[PDB]
Design a protein around this ligand. Sequence first.
Ligand SMILES: COc1cc(Br)cc(OC)c1[C@@H]1C(C)=N[n+]2c1nc(C)nc2N(CCCC(F)(F)F)CCCC(F)(F)F
Lengths: 160, 263
Amino acid sequence: NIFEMLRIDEGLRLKIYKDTEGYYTIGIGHLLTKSPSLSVAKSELDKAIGRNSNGVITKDEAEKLFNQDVDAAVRGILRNAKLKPVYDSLDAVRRSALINMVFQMGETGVAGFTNSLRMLQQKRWDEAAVNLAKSRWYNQTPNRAKRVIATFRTGTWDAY
Amino acid sequence: MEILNEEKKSKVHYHVAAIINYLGHCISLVALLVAFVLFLRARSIRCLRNIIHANLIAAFILRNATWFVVQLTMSPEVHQSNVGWCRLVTAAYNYFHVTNFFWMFGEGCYLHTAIVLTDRLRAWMFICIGWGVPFPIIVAWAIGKLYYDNEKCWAGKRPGVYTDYIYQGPMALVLLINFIFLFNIVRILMTKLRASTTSETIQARKAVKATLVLLPLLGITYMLAFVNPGEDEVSRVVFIYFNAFLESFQGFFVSVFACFLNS
Ligand SMILES: COc1cc(Br)cc(OC)c1[C@@H]1C(C)=N[n+]2c1nc(C)nc2N(CCCC(F)(F)F)CCCC(F)(F)F
């Protein structure tokens, strides 16, 4: 379900587009190359896609790129000493909510939520939610934040 | 003469069919209602999968319920008056008939998506397909009834009018697409996912078996409508009895189908 989750929260684009800083990206936020040259961007695509390298990709192609990025996210999570123990103590639904957060704010952002992180490792889920909501994150993207917290509180997909 | 005795014999056999049809509809309505309350009681109601089962069951309860009121429009006096509530009851019944098709289509959309893309928000797509798309089709059919066939409470059958195609052709199309879905699910499950043991995979295989069981059971009655069997007394008695059993127990079959999948 993780693929549909990020897709509601971030969006899906099937052709090459340029981000606010101007690099070339595709899928659920997959950066190809920072070069201003599209050729290098498209070719970086050809190797991953293993097909005719074109601007448009299949929805299926999106999920393999997405999956590659999900590996990279878990690899970062395991390297961080504050993130690794909470991830190992968590079920599969709650792990996705952590990965969701890493997609949005990076590994360094999540490590700052020190109290909520211990509440989660102690399965004190009601208190984790109050701590998470008292943040600037909650105020800047509230509807996404309410979904991710809800997943933490109940361990279900019910919100997405 | 004895022709009259032949006519009296037919009425008795038609009257037996009517008891088959009423009793079947009563049993089916009760079975669906029990399944509905069981689905709602469980905390698994918040899964997208159970939301779809619950709406499907609800759709069948309304159709089976309005079938009784339709019976009160089949009096010859009412059939010919074409009064307003006459036509409203027929149109509500066709609408529910159409929702039944689109909700069975919705189930096929879920099973195809579940095995290919890894709940309360996504449901709106299925509610809009199951409940919302049929409404304008029925309105369009109604405008066509109002304008080319305003007779017999819109339940008339006359050769050369194709108004009912407005709603019947959409029905056939979603069944065509559901057959394409079933071939890909079977192909996907047989080639890839042959060794897969994910929860979605086990449930998908349970679905494919049940769907294969149900497809013959529901299909005979749809073809039997086109049979035009004949005047053999033995052929007539069984044809009418067997078909009445099959149409009237359809809701019961769908309620076993949904409960089984819940496991
Ligand atoms: C493909 O199939 C399929 C597939 C899948 Br993946 C899934 C499913 O479900 C889950 C399904 C199904 C069935 C089993 N049936 N169905 C359908 N779907 C549709 C759309 N439709 C129908 N129908 C019958 C058929 C029959 C024949 F024989 F014709 F076939 C109609 C009627 C409906 C009501 F409700 F009204 F009854």
